[PDB]
Amino acid sequence: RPKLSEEQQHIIAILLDAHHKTYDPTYADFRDFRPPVRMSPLSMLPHLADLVSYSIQKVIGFAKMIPGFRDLTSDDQIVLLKSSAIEVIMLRSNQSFTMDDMSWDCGSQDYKYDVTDVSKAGHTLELIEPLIKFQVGLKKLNLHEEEHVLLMAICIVSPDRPGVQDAKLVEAIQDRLSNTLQTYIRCRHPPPGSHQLYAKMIQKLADLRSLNEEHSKQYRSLSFQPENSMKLTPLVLEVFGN
């Protein structure tokens, strides 16, 4: 019988609040980034580097609040964040993504991003096409905020990331979150929306591994010309590579 324990409602309450403390749906800090230019070879690189850098900071803030994450070694915390960052950024961006025009709508036209914006940061359709496909299939799940925050947390605490030490520890933390998610859908997600919802959510994590790979490829090519590398941030260089 599907029962959401005390522990499980606690986990969801913590992850919701963690998300609330690290995602500002008013997008007010965007005015601090180097300004967007849509005139234009890699004209969007400065602005989008800043947006991603900022996003990395919020992801790290969210990760620290994941129940059990604290119990990991600093080294494993680091490995989980470096490998998952771009994935959790893609996940968290779903909240501003819109199927009307397939863009990310962050409050205003200046901060409304589409495929050509992402191109003008130095990316090709090899990445962007499967990116848009992902966003669409994710948006169509119409996840409860509860499922969304659990999905981000499950993504971060992944035992198979290359470089993990205490995989067994990472696996047990993630299981506690998996089980909370499975149980949540059962108890609080009505059919038909609930049908295979967990398997479809995990499929989105598989999709993200592939997006992560392609992003890495194009980032290594982007960041090889030191003139592009110059336009990035110190946090982006540290987290994505140098």
Partner: peptide, 11 residues
Amino acid sequence: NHPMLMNLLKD
């Protein structure tokens, strides 16, 4: 060698 990520992670 991750001073900034380390710093943002600290208690």
